[PDB]
């Protein structure tokens, strides 16, 4: 265990930030790690949603919740497309309670849009919740739009730190050997390329930029009563320590693990497209088994949870794979 | 006295039933008549059976089932009352069930009209209202009497 | 040409349709719903809301 | 009769409901595409494989 560490937790300014990270920890269960890597490529039939958390963003130490949804969005760009709406519902509290002014002009526009009109966007001027039930329809969560905003550039900024990484490839080693694909065209995400230079590693530098701009949001939140001023300073000893730990993983993360997905994209059985390189516009395009003589059976449906671990995706499986995990470090 | 329309030896009676029952006015039936399907789950729920009771008893049984099914309130509107009994800033994540768990609504009037009638008859009634209240504040650890 | 309600006539009828209930519809049970405490009591707002 | 096992063919099992069963009597089940509404579209010539 080494993600609340570095020594210097024997400082009575950390005590609050101490338990916040500790009560957000998971254990390195061998099977739980494998299930996260496998869910990234495997097709689904039940519309799974995240294990929801109730947390009113009170103090500067509550940034440890929004940062979790950042790291979950990178290592898994697909798998993030399905839950982009339910993760949005608990993200709006960070844009309302944390800083109140910018949300007032954003919700004035609306919380949901339709992608139709053969192009363009149709934002509905009303505030509504997500729920995850209306996932498979004509409703995209409007907080992930990208549309250049009128009077809250301040929010439309950090609302870009969820951007997809790597490239999308047309898998050929499956279509050349005639494996059955349920999509007309075989496609996938990668999802983060590999090393190109000698000692650069752009994936590690991209995260460094996130840490840089995400630090200013914490180093600006004007608080009062002093106890948050105590944790407002002792949070950078976690905000900067974590970014150094990251540059010690990225090499063995975007090389040995990158070639893993590259091959696994084109297996015998995998057939559907779970691509998510554009969170602004993407839908499942499901099929149905119907007879003209009164029969109806869909392929993907809302029912959940089933008596299997293939519903409710745990988002806490991020901290064990940054600390309590030795890679082959590249026999 | 219609299901025996072709099983009795008594000759005169047989021709008479197979005449007024065969009539273009009335008709006899037995068993499953129709089915009401589910919206989201897609399973059979409320089935109609052409049963063999009498009209006086069958009328009463239908008032109960209709009031149970037309309540429109799922067993999930139960956690909204279960939450009014804890710290103001707490919440729940409901195990969604929907139409598969219909629950009759909580009566607004019959209770307040009765808890008023009982209040006058038994004036000691407040005894177990100030008592249930005092058992709550004691269970929340607000005051502990140390010695000074 | 409609059906005359039989709940108001004299002569007693036998064998009417009764709205039953299949095994699916379960009533009066339990939900394993969980709680999440307000974590801190100091920053709770009853004042307005 | 032919060794082919059927652990749970034709029914869905939710953990907070139990075991609900569907019917298995389709006919000319032509797998076609659903529109966002739910209403059946058409063949989808030029797409769908």
């Amino acid at each position: 265990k080494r993600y609340f560490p570095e020594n210097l937790e024997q400082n009575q300014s950390a005590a609050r930030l101490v338990s916040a990270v500790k009560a957000r920890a998971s254990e390195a269960d061998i099977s739980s790690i494998h299930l996260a890597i496998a869910r990234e490529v495997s097709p689904m039939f039940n519309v799974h949603e995240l294990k929801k958390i109730a947390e009113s963003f009170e103090d500067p130490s509550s940034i440890v919740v929004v940062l979790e949804f950042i790291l979950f969005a990178l290592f898994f760009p697909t798998e993030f497309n399905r839950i982009k709406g339910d993760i949005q519902n608990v993200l709006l509290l960070f844009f309302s309670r944390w800083y109140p002014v910018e949300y007032g002009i954003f919700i004035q526009r609306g919380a949901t849009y339709t992608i139709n009109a053969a192009g363009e966007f149709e934002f509905s001027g009303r505030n509504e919740k997500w729920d995850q039930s209306l996932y498979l329809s004509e409703h995209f969560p409007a907080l992930f739009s990208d549309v250049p905003l009128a009077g809250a550039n301040t929010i439309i900024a950090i609302m870009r730190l969820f951007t997809p990484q790597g490239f999308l490839r047309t898998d050929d080693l499956a279509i050349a050997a005639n494996f059955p694909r349920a999509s007309r065209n075989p496609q996938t995400y990668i999802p983060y390329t590999n090393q190109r230079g000698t000692v650069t590693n752009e994936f590690a530098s991209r995260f460094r930029t996130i840490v840089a701009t995400l630090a200013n949001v914490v180093n600006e939140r004007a608080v009062q009563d002093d106890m948050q001023k105590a944790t407002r300073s002792c949070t950078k000893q976690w905000l900067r320590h974590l970014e150094t730990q990251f540059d010690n993983i990225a090499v063995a993360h975007t090389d040995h693990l990158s070639v893993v997905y590259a091959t696994m994209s084109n297996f015998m059985l995998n057939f559907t497209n779970n691509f998510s390189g554009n969170h602004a516009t993407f839908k499942p395009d499901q099929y149905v088994i119907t007879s003209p003589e009164g029969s109806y059976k869909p392929i993907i449906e809302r029912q959940g949870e089933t008596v299997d671990g293939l519903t409710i995706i745990d988002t806490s499986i991020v901290w064990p794979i940054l600390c309590q995990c030795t890679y082959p470090l590249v026999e | 006295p219609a299901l025996l329309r072709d099983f009795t030896q008594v000759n005169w009676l047989n021709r008479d039933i197979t005449n007024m029952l065969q009539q273009a006015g009335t008709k006899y039936g037995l068993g499953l008549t129709e089915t009401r399907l589910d919206y989201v789950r897609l399973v059979k729920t409320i089935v109609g059976h052409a049963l063999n009771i009498d009209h006086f008893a069958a009328s009463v049984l239908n008032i109960n089932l209709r009031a149970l099914m037309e309540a429109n309130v799922t067993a999930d509107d139960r956690i909204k009352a279960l939450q009014a009994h804890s710290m103001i800033s707490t919440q729940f994540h409901g195990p969604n069930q929907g139409a598969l768990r219909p629950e009759l609504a909580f009566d607004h009037d019959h209770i307040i009209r009765c808890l008023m009638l009982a209040a006058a008859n038994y004036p000691r009634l407040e005894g177990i209202i100030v008592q249930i209240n005092t058992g709550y504040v004691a269970s929340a650890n607000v005051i502990r009497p140390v010695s000074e | 040409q409609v059906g005359i309600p039989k709940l108001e006539v004299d002569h007693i009828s036998f064998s009417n349709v009764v709205s039953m209930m299949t095994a699916n519809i379960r009533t009066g049970d339990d939900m394993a719903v969980e709680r999440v405490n307000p974590d801190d009591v100091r920053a709770i707002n009853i004042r307005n809301a | 009769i032919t060794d082919v096992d059927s652990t749970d063919y034709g029914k869905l099992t939710l953990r907070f409901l139990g075991t609900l069963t569907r019917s298995l009597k389709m006919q000319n089940a032509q797998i076609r595409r659903i529109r966002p509404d739910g209403t059946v579209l058409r063949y989808d010539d030029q797409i769908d494989i």
Binding site: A25, D314 | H93 | D29, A32, E34 | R15
Partner: peptide, 16 residues
């Protein structure tokens, strides 16, 4: 220790 679990959680019991 905070162990990673997937599905919904079980605690108090509601009632008819």
């Amino acid at each position: 220790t905070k162990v990673i679990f997937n599905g919904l959680d079980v605690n108090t019991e509601v009632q008819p």
